[PDB]
């Protein structure tokens, strides 16, 4: 029959969970955000649609920090993304309290994974309306992850989600090919800025604001920091130069 898409935990005849797939539609509808893994860190960047001149510039931040070394960015339902970061923060604090060492990125990835996967097990809860790109620097290198509403996640060289995910993915793939030895933190910040400006073309009707953050072992000492001032503008120009 039909109606398999009306309750969460229900399998359809083809083994699918339609409510999760409907959550993906909410993500696809949202703003585009990316993550770039460099030779000693990670770079996160997001599009910020300027609905009106009344929006105070640089104030409405989207990128969130977990602990002091992890950065999280998401596309879709923003409140749902905050809920996941709130849990991630609790989850990280639990780890550090017991094990002393700040949570490794793969460890943190599974923690967010199991929690999102749990929201697909029961009909009393709704699946997360976000795809989250996160990562940082730990004991043994840099890690970049992307998490889906299904609870599925993988490690990434580069990641993209949202409106202009395809434009971004295409650009990220070019980078992977043209830099087999590895991109640098400095290069990635600029390169990210470009990808957003290019991926914005799938939403060119509205003006936008760029936001970049990074976590590099040499550049930020392995801590998550927001790209501000001169370094931001340097990346703004780099993108505004190559858009033409």
């Amino acid at each position: 029959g039909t109606g398999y898409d009306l309750s969460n935990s229900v399998f359809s005849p083809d083994g699918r969970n339609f409510q999760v797939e409907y959550a993906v539609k909410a993500v696809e509808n949202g703003t585009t955000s990316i993550g770039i893994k460099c030779n000693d860190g990670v770079v996160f960047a997001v599009e910020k649609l300027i609905t009106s001149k009344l929006l105070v510039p640089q104030k409405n931040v989207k990128i969130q920090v977990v602990d002091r070394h992890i950065g999280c960015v998401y596309s879709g339902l923003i409140p749902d993304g905050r809920h996941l970061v709130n849990r991630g923060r609790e989850e990280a604090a639990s780890f550090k309290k017991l094990y002393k060492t700040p949570i490794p990125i793969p460890a943190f990835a599974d923690r967010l994974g199991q929690y999102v996967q749990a929201h697909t097990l029961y009909n009393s809860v709704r699946p997360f309306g976000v795809s989250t790109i996160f990562g940082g620097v730990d004991k043994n290198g840099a890690h970049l992850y992307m998490l889906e509403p299904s609870g599925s996640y993988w490690g990434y060289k580069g990641a993209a989600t949202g409106k202009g995910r395809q434009s971004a993915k295409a650009e990220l793939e070019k980078l992977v090919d043209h830099h087999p030895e590895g991109l640098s933190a400095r290069e990635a910040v600029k390169q990210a800025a470009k990808i957003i400006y290019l991926a914005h073309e799938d939403n060119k009707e509205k003006d936008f604001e760029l936001e970049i953050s990074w976590c590099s072992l040499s550049e930020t000492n392995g801590l998550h920091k927001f790209v501000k001032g001169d370094l931001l503008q340097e990346a703004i120009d780099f993108a505004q130069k190559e858009i033409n």
């Binding site: 399998f11 005849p13 083994g15 699918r16 994974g113 996967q117 970049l144 993988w154 990434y156 993915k169």
Partner: protein
């Protein structure tokens, strides 16, 4: 009336459609996996398919290290697979603490099968769209392959296969054992048992493999481990110098 296909309650035929559709989800990944028993080892083979270029291939895995001795390969969506993996690891650690010895492969299998049976009977819990193949060299039973499904069913195998093209692998392995007249691979080294597993994987599927198309896990006395891309490449070189 028509909700007998939404929750785990009996249909007029005495069937459970949600269990049946959970089985369907196990093939969603489009990956085949086989397990064979050596003379004193157990080898699992699973296809590795990394489509996206942006993916880190080192993070893509469906084989899990449950305990020092227990290994588990999954067929089905990865979020459900990791859900089953974490629980099995947690169950393995607890058993050791409570009873003073390492949890046997068949016991963990039964435990996970029992746990899967609950979701089959209780309405608020959904079945996991996964099939779990547990492997080890038990200190009492020797090389062991025990496999569970969404129905809550479990049993031991001389050798087994799971996936979309499961039947071809199964009948291939069947024919070899009808021939050899024994229930295992009569080999001393695991390296050759791994080679056997890859060989019959090729013959049944009719496909050649590179070092990045496969995924191997080996269980031995007091250890289970996975092979690296180069460990597999070495195994692929040896099978080439035979055909």
């Amino acid at each position: 009336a028509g909700y007998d296909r939404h929750i785990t309650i009996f249909s007029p035929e005495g069937r459970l459609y949600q269990v049946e559709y959970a089985f369907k989800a196990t093939n969603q990944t489009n990956i085949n996996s086989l397990a064979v028993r050596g003379k004193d080892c157990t080898v699992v083979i699973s296809q590795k398919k990394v489509p996206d270029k942006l993916l880190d291939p080192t993070t893509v895995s469906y084989i899990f290290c449950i305990s020092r001795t227990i290994g588990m390969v999954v067929n089905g969506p990865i979020p459900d697979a990791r859900n089953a993996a974490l629980r099995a690891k947690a169950e393995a650690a607890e058993f050791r603490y409570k009873y003073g010895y390492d949890m046997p492969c068949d016991v963990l299998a039964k435990r996970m099968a029992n746990l899967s049976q609950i979701y089959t009977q209780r309405a608020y819990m959904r079945p996991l769209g996964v099939i779990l193949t547990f492997v080890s060299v038990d200190e009492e039973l020797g090389p062991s392959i025990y496999k569970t499904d969404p129905a809550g069913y479990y049993v031991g195998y001389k050798a087994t296969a799971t996936g979309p093209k499961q039947q071809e692998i199964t009948t291939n392995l069947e024919n070899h054992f009808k021939k050899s007249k024994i229930d295992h691979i009569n080999e001393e080294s695991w390296e050759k048992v791994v080679e056997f597993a890859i060989t019959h994987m090729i013959d049944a599927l009719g496909t050649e493999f590179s070092k990045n198309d496969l995924e191997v896990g080996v269980a031995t006395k007091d250890k289970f481990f996975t092979l690296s891309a180069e460990n597999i490449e070495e195994r692929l070189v040896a099978i080439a110098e035979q055909d």
